[PDB]
Design a protein around this ligand. Sequence first.
Ligand SMILES: *[C@@H]1O[C@H](CO)[C@@H](O)[C@H](O)[C@H]1NC(C)=O
Ligand SMILES: *[C@@H]1O[C@H](CO)[C@@H](O)[C@H](O)[C@H]1NC(C)=O
Lengths: 371, 375, 214, 213, 220, 219
Amino acid sequence: MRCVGVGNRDFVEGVSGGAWVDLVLEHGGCVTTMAQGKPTLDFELTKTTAKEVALLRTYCIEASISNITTATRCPTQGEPYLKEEQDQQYICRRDVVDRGWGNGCGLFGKGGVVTCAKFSCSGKITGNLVQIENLEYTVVVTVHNHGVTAMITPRSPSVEVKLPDYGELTLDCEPRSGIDFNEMILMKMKKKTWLVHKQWFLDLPLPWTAHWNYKERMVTFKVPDVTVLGSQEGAMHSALAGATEVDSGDGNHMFAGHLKCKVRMEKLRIKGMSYTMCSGKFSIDKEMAETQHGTTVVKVKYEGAGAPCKVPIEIRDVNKEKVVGRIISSTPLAENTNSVTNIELEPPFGDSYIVIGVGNSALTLHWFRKG
Amino acid sequence: MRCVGVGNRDFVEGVSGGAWVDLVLEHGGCVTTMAQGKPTLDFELTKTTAKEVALLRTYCIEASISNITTATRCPTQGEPYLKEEQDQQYICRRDVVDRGWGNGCGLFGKGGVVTCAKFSCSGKITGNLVQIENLEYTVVVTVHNHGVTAMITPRSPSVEVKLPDYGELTLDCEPRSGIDFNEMILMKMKKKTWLVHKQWFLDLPLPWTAGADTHWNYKERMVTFKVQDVTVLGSQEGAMHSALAGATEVDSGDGNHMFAGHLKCKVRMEKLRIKGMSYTMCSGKFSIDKEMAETQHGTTVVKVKYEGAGAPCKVPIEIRDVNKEKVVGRIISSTPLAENTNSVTNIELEPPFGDSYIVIGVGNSALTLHWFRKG
Amino acid sequence: ELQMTQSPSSLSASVGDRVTITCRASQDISIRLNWYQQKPGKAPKLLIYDASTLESGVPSRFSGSGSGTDFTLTISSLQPEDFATYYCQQFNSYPLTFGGGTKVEIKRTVAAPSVFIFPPSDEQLKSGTASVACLLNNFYPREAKVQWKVDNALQSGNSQESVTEQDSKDNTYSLSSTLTLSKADYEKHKVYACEVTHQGLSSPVTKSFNRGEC
Amino acid sequence: ELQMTQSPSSLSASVGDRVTITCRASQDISIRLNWYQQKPGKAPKLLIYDASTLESGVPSRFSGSGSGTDFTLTISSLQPEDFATYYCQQFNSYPLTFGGGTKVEIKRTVAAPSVFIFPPSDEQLKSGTASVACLLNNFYPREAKVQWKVDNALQSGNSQESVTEQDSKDNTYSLSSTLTLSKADYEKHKVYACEVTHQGLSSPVTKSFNRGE
Amino acid sequence: EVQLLESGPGLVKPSETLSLTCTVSGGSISDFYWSWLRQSPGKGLEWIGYAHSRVSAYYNPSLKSRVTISVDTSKNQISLRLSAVTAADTALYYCARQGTGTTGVSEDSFDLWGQGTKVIVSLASTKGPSVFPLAPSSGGTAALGCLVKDYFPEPVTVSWNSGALTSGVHTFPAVLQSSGLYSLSSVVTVPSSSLGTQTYICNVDHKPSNTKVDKKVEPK
Amino acid sequence: EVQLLESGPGLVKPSETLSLTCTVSGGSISDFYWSWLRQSPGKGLEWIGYAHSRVSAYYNPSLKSRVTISVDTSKNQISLRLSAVTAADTALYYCARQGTGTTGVSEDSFDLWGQGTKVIVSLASTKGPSVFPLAPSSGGTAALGCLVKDYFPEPVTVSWNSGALTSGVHTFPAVLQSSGLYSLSSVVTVPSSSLGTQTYICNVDHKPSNTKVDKKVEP
Ligand SMILES: *[C@@H]1O[C@H](CO)[C@@H](O)[C@H](O)[C@H]1NC(C)=O
Ligand SMILES: *[C@@H]1O[C@H](CO)[C@@H](O)[C@H](O)[C@H]1NC(C)=O
């Protein structure tokens, strides 16, 4: 009953004998499977996550200047030297200024100067390498009546999924992504994570780490002064306008692609296939409503004593003679006395009568389908 | 004495009779003027600033989301409405979500939803229109012995500059800028102001205002709506700095104002005079206060102290040959004077290539200095 | 909801006999049932899966029968290796429920218990507690009744019975009942009796002793 | 350090006479000098610029002379309009310094002052202070000496002299000396005298009064 | 061979959370469905629930609210976590391989079973056993024993004449007294002629309290 | 046509900063060099300094450390600002047009002068004048006056018989007393026969204290 209400929904019917169903799973989309002698199931790809990811490079977006030291030298004299020049944490630049009597020198000419400032990074961006081999696909299987979750990885594509009271299925899948992971990088900022190109990330003009390499990308020296580029947080958001975000910070992470699956319904069974037909009265708990795909959903309460039994439902014609409609929910059951059952029906185009129960005590509902 | 020590220095000599000197002034560069019967001066263009600038557009770089209101509606029912939709301060977006029994609706289908959030700007960037007509050029004139400042605008290009004890000059200038102001915009960020293209500023993808009241047009440029959720672009302060890497900044916020261009001037030295032209020649002894040093242009600067009583008088300086017979060098500082007893005087001399003797004083008591110039 | 009831609780049979273990279900479970064998101390062992199919290594004597509600476990010729507790489990509906259990015991000739009464030691009396142990050495069948008498008055509480598993040599059971009384309650009474009721005995035998004698 | 000294401080001359005003400079200032005319209450007026060149509207009688250190201002024929204070200023070196000033006054026949003594009013005595005013109405020249006598003893302090500008009608000056004493000091003495010494008078005239008479 | 080893501790105080581990040796844990089961007299074999490395765990409605079963592939062990533990939870916990059709033997049939871990639920302190002799009274054979009274927890090792005497020895199962401590008795059948000539000593060993009590049985 | 108007206030307490403004009417302020000058007896004409709309201001070394002169083109006025004002700064301040050669007669010659603003430096409070009569004593003409004692600041308007009596009137300049207040006297010469028949009243008007005192003189 999971796919009921979902807009992007696909109905897949099995082979004449059953045993196997070919389906395609993607984020947002819901798949309803139908097979002869097998129960109706609801398949949905909840999450796709990268388990083991190797770190490639870490850039600096937010920085600040600290402890500025200036070393001055008059003409003819040697070049100025500072202890901060050999230290990797400090950024140093060498230049020559016009020195003389006004500057405080005995001789006139270009005098050597060196400025050193401490580089401190507060905001850093992480970039992890992606691989198709390390991708965990979470598929939820729900029966027509919170379901059962299953993990799929290219290493272990086929997984035997157990469904209590309904037996079990063999879920064999194949990951098919239209994006080349060899040319992609999983870049993480604060809480959110994006899927960006490999070259774009490596060509970013910011200081990076395998001590920061290329510190001059954010620190600018003014010959008379040190200036910082500020926070590149907003600068990234503008460039990430076209890039698809994996994790949103809420925990919901998804990758653009399709998961082609071949569900083996060999050992699957319908709960209550041996149940007798309900003899007692039936009453509508909730009025029958039409879905976005033309199918109708109805809630019925059992008033008899023959429980656990099978709900007798038939979609008959205008003159209520021959059955001209099919039931999606495979073999609906009434568990106990005064129990509510959810049923998905497929009425034909035009006038149709839904008969729920047995004999004259049976409930009759009129329905009209447009198109 | 201002141009002394400055690397980018140009020496301009006047006409045979004097009266006028043609010069070019630029930022960083210093100009030294020399004329017969007129004192030696130092010209330098300190600052260039735009006085009257008209506001064109104000963009928002830093924003924050406040008071989020979500209105939900089930299928078959009407579209959701909020009071914030008509209010200009709020950003609203309409969409449809999959509604049913699980969502809390009687019927299945696409249900209308509307999200409204208050837009508040904390960091804003202004862009003013710049033209050649409104530009104030500040020129500093310093005598050889901090000086006198003069303002030049295309409206009033010629300005009569008074130099105390030295008379006065008529400074006629012409502003020559190689940049088209019709295609430029004076953009200001916090305390710093840049000179950017007109089209680049107008094509910026940020919310803007026609005025400058302390309602934003195109609020969606920073606010993004999710499938319910609202996100802000953050602070575009760092984003601008990357784009301003090639653009030249006018004001640094400290006080330095500058524009790329040249200021062609024709200084009229008609009423100019040298201080102490009627002063007698110094009879007393002279001593070097500071040793003679060579500049980047070959010229030599020396400090001398007067020990006599004939003050105020003229310092007798001559740049003679190896055999100290004939004068073979010239003095840059026009008529140097010794104000009082034990007073120090700064003198700029031009010795010739090779051996030369500098004689400071009179008779046998005179100070003699040996100098050699390479090249 | 679904209850698994297996009959009988205990079964007595000789080596070579044909035994029938019945497992009943409250609802239809079709051919979905499993049979298990469990010896004391050891973990259960699967014999018959899918109500009739035999597991690899399980002898031909073991056979599975039944479909729907009533099920059967049959051993054509009983062996000394087969004497263990048998369990039945369902797998048609969740949760997976197991049966009561059927203990298959060795059939032995009816033997009367050798009753012995033990008075509480002086070492125990120093602590403040007195325990009277009553031994019922070697008997068949397991069904035996033990009644305590403080001073001709029947004792309901303070009694704890313990039965040993069927012996490997003589195939008989043993019972040890302990009557726990305080030092003040023990010294208050004289004659302590232990009445034993068993199939092997004609009338209930009573072994007794007097406080501080012989 | 350049000082501008002009001689004389004051000059007495009749209408039609030739006057000579001299301005001296401590250093050589060449032709760089300006002459000014100032009447009491009114702002100064430039007459001669560049040591000799006359300003527009200034009469032909005014003439400028001098170069270097010694300078001269000459009025060929003095007129009643010309009686004002004359100043000289330099413009060769900064700061711009002005001269001492030369007041040109009307030459008049020697006249003796009409001396009057005024006793302090009863209204002033109630406050606690007593002021004795001594009038010297209409006299020439300005040079006059006033001496106070509390009780035949000469008074040095408490005296304040005030002289009016040369009158338009008779061309004479007037002096008013005020002797300020306390109520206790005034009631302690009897005869209050005011001795006046002037060129017009033969011997010093003394106007006196007795306390409460 | 594929083996299942159960890890304790086998003593949890009421209201506290019980934690048990099942190690899978000589076979991959990521392929099979692993289930936990408990056995106690009066309740019998009770299925707690199953857990898989890739598939979500499912539990019995009787324990679902307080039980959590997970599969640790890196450590090759299945962890059982039962919270708000009461006196009714006192059982022998087994870890077994739940069949599917491709794995094991058949769908939902436990083929491979663990050794089993005894879990006792009580606030009772660890006490050494107080051994008292059951002296023989004056047909041809007489009985004598040892009363292993007041000890916690289980088990206890009782032997006669340092393992020499085995014939006639009957070590009765322990009974939980009202005090929360266990009571045990071990009786031996010997001839009447052997009394006086042969000395009888019972060797009682209790490992949780680290006590070895040797008591000699003789008539008063 | 070009006029220079000086604005006060003409009273500043010692240590406080003095502010004076000179308005240029009937001519452009941005063309000429404007200078401030002060006049006081004992110091004479003292040149403070000049200021220009485009060219930097220059001052006298005696006041340079305290004085600041600026040209306001938008308001058409020259502002004079002298800080740490002492008793020696008590002078009549003038604003004049300093010549160049192309503008205002000749180089450094003040052709156009202002009206002048009297500035008095004292902590003294504004007090009304206490008028006392100077009664005539018993040749043919007798003298009588009025003693305008203890008043601050300057000036004072003294007239005889409501402006009717002018001949013989001698209003002496004010003298600054030790108390910080001014003392003035106005004496008139009238015939001896006029005494008793003609009534003499002096009309003393002091605008800063808004007082008009009329005192009758009689022996
Ligand atoms: C840098 O400057 C800060 C601020 O004065 C001071 O606290 C710190 O000790 C300095 N660090 C070094 C390494 O000099
Ligand atoms: C926005 O939220 C604040 C804080 O709760 C509240 O005080 C204010 O009334 C709200 N303003 C509007 C316009 O809804």
